[PDB]
Design a protein around this ligand. Structure first.
Ligand SMILES: [Zn+2]
Ligand SMILES: [Zn+2]
Ligand SMILES: [Zn+2]
Lengths: 224, 84, 164, 107, 335, 98
């Protein structure tokens, strides 16, 4: 009976899910445009633990001897201390991380952090670190503009919809919202330098892989 | 009702269904002694040759993608990016 | 019941709360009783939820119900599958069942699998109402000797006068 | 909007539709003691201007019959005072994407 | 297929629009007219007659000739025939519908028994299921039994509102085989208006009442102004399927042979003619009626064998039969 | 077992394997070639292939005409519907006059 009720529902080229009549059932398949065989359970960190922990983890205050990036994690570490213009970039990144946390805590009122999403970021990073034999001893040659502006640019490339009008572009921003929250928390500046230790080379490799895998995760029109 | 080469909002990427049908159409032709467009570095199995033609973007085929409303877009096998 | 809640420091903590479980349903009237949290009241009767809270709330509930029936055996099913089912049952504003409502249809074609030894009648009415067959099904297209506009056939292929 | 206590007379009820276009709505006090829109399972419905409606129907390129539907008497439509033909944008949280918007047209 | 050429662009069916064949179209496309209920031998001289199996329809004898379409018994897609009916007749498959439509519309002017003035009718009218809406309107209308002239407005019941003027009483229609019977009365048990009246509703009356139903009215019903007008459920011009449908078993040479459908067609044709030969020669009323219902019996059985009898009188004394619906019972059941 | 029924078909549909479904579900019946009016979806087209003349009277058609291949069992089923006063309009365009 279930088969009979859904048999005619297919994904069209507009990413819409419709029945034989042409009626819209889902304005975008699965509310995210993704193919289920390309989704994996991942942990949305931004959502868990105490705020102190949230701040210790993501907060970068170039204007504070204590809450700055130690000059050993970064090559240009010393000359970054007290940099007003960069600190403006780093505050944009933090306000966004704090919004994300609020947002997530509303969607998953529970507090649950592991949810199936496409592109396994942790795996991509474990690859980079092995591929470029990244030594956890020397400071990275990544710029703060490299990371912040880099992660910001990538987000404009994770495409599910392409329409050039206003409606579609909003639909596009919506569909990619949850994934982008995972993204921003995985590629926050302190994380990239303190935890992962990516070099400019490994990092640029990580960004293009995430885009490749993501696009490879979108559902194909014609899916029954 | 056709859409200009510009303004196509459909995927730049080839779908697994298109790849399956193109390879099958092309293979059928090769199975009937139709002219091949690549160098058979030893191949003899049609589908296997078709796959070779695809990789070298030498399949003169076009895909007509219809939209639920009736309009449609045209993408050449050449254009389509193949990553699956 | 234990309840995961944000503590003042930020981390989630368990905060037990008394809850009332009943035998019988009257959502509209209990919902209004003083002393409760009308914001969180619930019932496994997604039909009453629809009539009191609307179809969108009806949908959400129907998903919660289907989902429980699958979690009860520890089984897991990706969200989209149950979601698609729940949207179809909800698209027309009401809760449309799936366990065969119509004696003729659901979404077919006056050509697909001739049901009832009197297909004749299925065609007689299609004629009397000017039924328009979309021809997207598999059987209709089999009767027509064509391939269905699905998956591998949801687009056409053509020769290209471009290739040099 | 006419709020009453126990009920109205079937006679008077037929007195409602009688002054076009000005519409008249009725509510039984009881059905208002609690605001359903404040409920957990109820996502935000937002009435679209007929202008936003054309843009909607245009970009997705749909007939009006191809949109999901919402009953004229749906508790939420009654709340918003929806009129046959009007469209509501429904913005809900999603475990899949962050937010997902759907649309329903009043029948 | 068929190794020949046609400058006609090859394509695939994308949509199938169902509907009813109107008498006009059945003629517009027909090739022959079909009179003589016999075939082959015009004073012995075998061949074919301008009555059946030839006037234009597909051919036999390996003769390419076939309306200039040439080709042969393998490339020629049988051409359809024409055949006027002396009197109009119900199409077996719609008697049920025909009755219900009569219980919805007034049997004197064709005005729906319930307007947009009635509240329970508005709800029904809003439904989008040509199947369910019809059902809702019918259950609401079969109640009314007097084409009202004045109805209470959306205001004071004190004030009335006018509508199509035709106060006449409605009949309760019951079905008897292939005929519809109506009973009249000026209310139930009221003084000087007791007892009923039973007159059989003639096909001609039904036909004209339907022809007086407005586009809006029959469309609020499941009917379509272009593909399916109510009036067309009633037969006037019957289509004659070409030879490919109704074959002819010819064993080489000098032997009879024509399919059962052709036979049945003959009787329809015969009965149709014996009916006309009761007007050109004048005749009693009850006589022209028996003749009518005779035609009706064949046009009905020609398509469906499931009524009062099983007409199996076709060159066979053993008495065997076949029909179109039946033909599909092995073409709807074999597919 | 050994059959290929409804459940088996649903699986092939899910895989999106359309031609396989076509290959496996199509019967023996010959692929017959018919002509059709583009105005009325009927098989009332007179074809004189040597003279290149196509006419669908009742419609005044000679240019707006097409050709299609369909199993002969279909041609019959359709002509049989025409015999019962029912019209099975075959159209080449999905986009109606809408
Ligand atoms: Zn011919
Ligand atoms: Zn009247
Ligand atoms: Zn025509």
């Amino acid at each position: 009976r279930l088969v009979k009720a859904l048999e005619d529902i297919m994904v069209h080229y507009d990413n819409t899910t419709r029945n034989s009549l042409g009626n819209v059932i889902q304005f975008i398949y699965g509310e995210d445009g993704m193919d289920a065989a390309h989704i994996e359970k991942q942990s949305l960190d931004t959502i868990g633990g105490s705020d102190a922990a949230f701040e210790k983890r993501y907060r970068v205050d170039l204007l504070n001897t204590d809450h700055t990036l130690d000059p050993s994690l970064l090559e240009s570490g010393s000359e970054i201390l007290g940099d007003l213009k960069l600190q403006v970039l780093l505050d944009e990144e933090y306000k966004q991380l704090v919004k994300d946390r609020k947002f997530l805590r509303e969607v998953f009122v529970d507090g649950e952090a592991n949810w199936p999403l496409p592109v396994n970021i942790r795996r991509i990073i474990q690859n980079a670190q092995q591929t470029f034999h990244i030594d956890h001893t020397k400071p990275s040659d990544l710029t703060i503009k490299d990371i912040v502006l880099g992660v910001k640019d990538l987000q404009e490339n994770l495409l599910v919809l392409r329409g050039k009008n206003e409606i579609i572009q909003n639909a596009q921003r919506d569909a990619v919202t949850l994934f982008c929250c995972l993204l921003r928390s995985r590629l926050a500046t302190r994380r990239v330098l303190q935890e992962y230790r990516l070099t400019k080379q490994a990092f640029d490799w990580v960004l293009s892989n995430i885009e490749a895998q993501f696009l490879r995760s979108v559902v194909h029109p014609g899916e029954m | 009702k056709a859409i200009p080469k510009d303004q196509r909002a459909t995927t730049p990427y080839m779908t697994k269904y298109e790849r399956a049908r193109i390879l099958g159409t092309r293979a059928l032709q090769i199975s009937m002694n139709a002219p091949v467009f690549v160098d058979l570095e030893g191949e003899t199995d049609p589908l296997r040759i078709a796959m070779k033609e695809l990789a070298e973007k030498k399949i003169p085929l076009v895909i007509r993608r219809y939209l639920p409303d009736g309009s449609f877009e045209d993408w050449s096998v050449e254009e389509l990016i193949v990553d699956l | 019941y234990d309840r995961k809640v944000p503590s003042p420091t930020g981390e989630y903590v368990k905060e037990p709360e008394w809850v009332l479980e009943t035998d019988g349903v009257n959502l509209s009237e209990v919902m209004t009783v003083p002393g409760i949290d009308p914001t969180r009241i619930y019932t496994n009767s997604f039909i009453d939820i629809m009539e009191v809270l609307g179809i969108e709330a009806g949908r959400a509930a129907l998903y919660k119900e289907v989902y429980n029936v699958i979690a009860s055996d520890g089984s897991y099913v990706n969200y989209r599958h149950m979601a698609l089912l729940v949207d179809v049952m909800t698209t027309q504003g009401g809760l449309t069942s799936v366990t065969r409502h119509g004696f003729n249809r659901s979404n077919t074609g006056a050509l697909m699998r001739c049901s009832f030894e009197e297909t004749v009648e299925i065609l007689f009415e299609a004629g009397a109402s000017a039924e328009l067959d979309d021809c997207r099904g598999v059987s209709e297209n089999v009767i027509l000797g064509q391939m269905a506009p699905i998956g591998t056939g949801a687009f056409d292929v053509m020769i290209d006068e471009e290739s040099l | 909007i006419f709020v009453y206590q126990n009920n109205i007379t079937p006679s008077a009820m037929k007195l409602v539709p009688s002054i076009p276009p000005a519409t008249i709505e009725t509510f039984n006090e009881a059905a208002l003691v609690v605001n359903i829109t404040h409920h957990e399972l109820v996502p935000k419905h937002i009435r679209l201007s007929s202008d936003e409606k054309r843009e909607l129907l245009k970009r997705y390129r749909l007939k009006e019959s191809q949109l999901p539907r919402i009953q004229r008497a749906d508790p939420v439509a009654l709340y918003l005072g929806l009129k046959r033909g009007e469209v509501v944008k429904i913005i809900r949280k999603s475990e899949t994407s962050g937010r997902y918007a759907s649309y329903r047209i009043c029948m | 297929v068929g190794q020949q050429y046609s400058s006609a662009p090859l394509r695939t069916v994308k949509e199938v629009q169902f509907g009813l064949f109107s008498p006009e179209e059945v003629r517009a496309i027909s090739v022959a007219k079909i009179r003589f209920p016999e075939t082959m031998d015009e004073t012995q001289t075998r061949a074919k007659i301008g009555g059946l199996n030839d006037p234009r329809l597909g051919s036999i004898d390996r003769n390419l000739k076939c309306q200039t379409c040439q080709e042969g018994m393998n490339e020629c897609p049988g051409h359809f025939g024409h055949i006027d009916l002396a009197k109009p007749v119900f199409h077996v498959g719609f008697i049920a519908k025909i009755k219900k439509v009569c219980e919805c519309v007034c049997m004197h002017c064709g005005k729906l028994l319930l307007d947009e003035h009635n509240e329970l009718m508005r709800q029904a009218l809003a439904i989008k299921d040509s199947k369910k809406r019809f059902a809702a309107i019918w259950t609401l209308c079969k109640t009314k039994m007097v084409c009202e002239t004045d109805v209470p407005s959306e205001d004071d019941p004190t004030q009335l509102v006018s509508r199509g003027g035709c106060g006449n009483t409605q009949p309760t229609i019951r079905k008897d085989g292939l005929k519809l019977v109506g009973s009249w009365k000026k209310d139930r048990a009221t003084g000087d208006a007791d007892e009923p009246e039973l007159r059989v509703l003639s096909t001609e009356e039904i036909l004209n009442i339907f022809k007086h139903i407005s586009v809006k009215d029959f469309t609020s019903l499941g009917f379509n102004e272009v593909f399916s007008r109510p009036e067309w459920m009633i037969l006037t011009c019957l289509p004659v399927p070409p030879p490919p449908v109704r074959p002819s078993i010819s064993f080489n040479e000098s032997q009879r042979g024509e399919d059962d459908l052709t036979f049945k067609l003959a009787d329809i044709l015969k009965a149709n003619i014996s009916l006309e030969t009761l007007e050109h020669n004048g005749a009693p009323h009850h006589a022209i009626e028996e003749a009518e219902s005779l035609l009706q019996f064949h046009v009905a059985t020609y398509m469906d064998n499931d009524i009062a009898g099983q007409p199996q009188a076709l060159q066979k004394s053993g008495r065997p039969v076949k029909s179109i619906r039946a033909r599909l019972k092995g073409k709807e059941g074999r597919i | 077992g050994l059959r290929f029924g409804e459940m088996e078909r649903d699986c092939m549909i899910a895989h999106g394997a359309a031609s396989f479904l076509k290959e496996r579900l199509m019967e023996a019946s010959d692929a017959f070639r018919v002509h059709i009016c583009g105005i009325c979806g009927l098989m009332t087209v007179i074809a004189k292939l040597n003279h290149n003349q196509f006419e669908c009277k009742g419609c005044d058609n000679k240019i707006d005409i097409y050709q299609i291949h369909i199993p002969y069992a279909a041609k019959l089923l359709f002509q049989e519907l025409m015999a019962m006063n029912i019209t099975p309009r075959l159209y080449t365009d999905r986009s109606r006059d809408f």
